[PDB]
Ligand binder design. Structure first.
Ligand code: HEM
Ligand code: HEM
Lengths: 149, 149
């Protein structure tokens, strides 16, 4: 499963290749992909809904998909992941980016760090439900997004 | 016209209101708006094309609108402006954001500062062709994006 603590073994050349493949199609239409994922996560995880101030008032999955605020937010998340995917070969760069992102969440957005793996789960279940290699990537991302807390 | 040097008078309550109105519709579909603007700017201003490394190979306005890299890039620009519009009342905040953005362009992206006003012109011509109040906002944005150079 997806972890957000400790450490995970390096990604193997085989795993990286599987990821790039499973990913490519999803990013080709991140506009949509992104929105669905975020809408799915949000509608099914009420406890974290209070952390998206700009979505106050939006309850149905219908309204959300029509809000430009939901789309922007969803588009940024989906690309942060895309950035990671693109840095799988430069673990150095991937860290700097996410560690910076971790800081923003902890100091400015003040979001509960427990949902990182919950949303990561939806992204994984959507992009490549079942792949363990992709679960590693999401675990690294989660572990790093919590580094600032 | 749009300036990127010196200073400009403060926005009047009247101008701000005109701006918010002319903007709202555009942002409601920034996904599209953004792409068109960026595609227009890029296709008609060759001299600045070499500054978008990720667009190498893309020449027709057809290819561009299909590239996820163009879309992401266009979506970020369009929102930076949206951020400004939202800060028209807090000139303080608007500065910090843009001054930071100025730095990234000068130190990391290494873009020629002369195109800020050229692209700003297309955004203005598209969102509210003719409005002088909107030209002020774009001027403030341009003056600030050059502060780091
Ligand atoms: C799946 C892992 C996640 C990634 C990679 C991620 C990525 C992002 C990105 C790319 C941004 C833009 C940062 C910026 O504005 O400069 C961001 C902003 C934000 N994130 Fe996360 N995020 C993740 C999970 C979460 C979770 C679980 C929450 C909390 C429920 C959350 C709440 C927010 C909020 C409140 C903002 C800013 C809202 C705004 O001003 O639009 N994020 N995130
Ligand atoms: C209309 C004024 C402009 C605004 C408000 C603006 C805003 C932005 C924003 C928000 C980003 C991303 C910042 C980040 O994530 O680090 C960006 C990136 C960038 N901008 Fe600008 N920009 C403007 C004009 C320009 C111009 C005219 C050039 C070209 C000469 C330029 C070239 C770049 C480059 C090279 C990037 C890298 C993005 C990438 O390909 O990944 N920008 N800009």
């Amino acid at each position: 499963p997806i972890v957000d603590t400790g450490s995970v073994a390096p990604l193997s050349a085989a795993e990286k290749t599987k990821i790039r493949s499973a990913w490519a199609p999803v990013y080709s239409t991140y506009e949509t992909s992104g929105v669905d994922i975020l809408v799915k996560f949000f509608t099914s995880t009420p406890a974290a809904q209070e952390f998206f101030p700009k979505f106050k008032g939006l309850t149905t999955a219908d309204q959300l998909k029509k809000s430009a605020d939901v789309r922007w937010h969803a588009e940024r998340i989906i690309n942060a992941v895309n950035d990671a995917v693109a840095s799988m070969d430069d673990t150095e760069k991937m860290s700097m980016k996410l560690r910076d992102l971790s800081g923003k969440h902890a100091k400015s957005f003040q979001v509960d760090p427990q949902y990182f793996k919950v949303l990561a789960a939806v992204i994984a279940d959507t992009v490549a439900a079942g792949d363990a290699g992709f679960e590693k990537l999401m675990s690294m991302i989660c572990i790093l997004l919590r580094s600032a807390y």
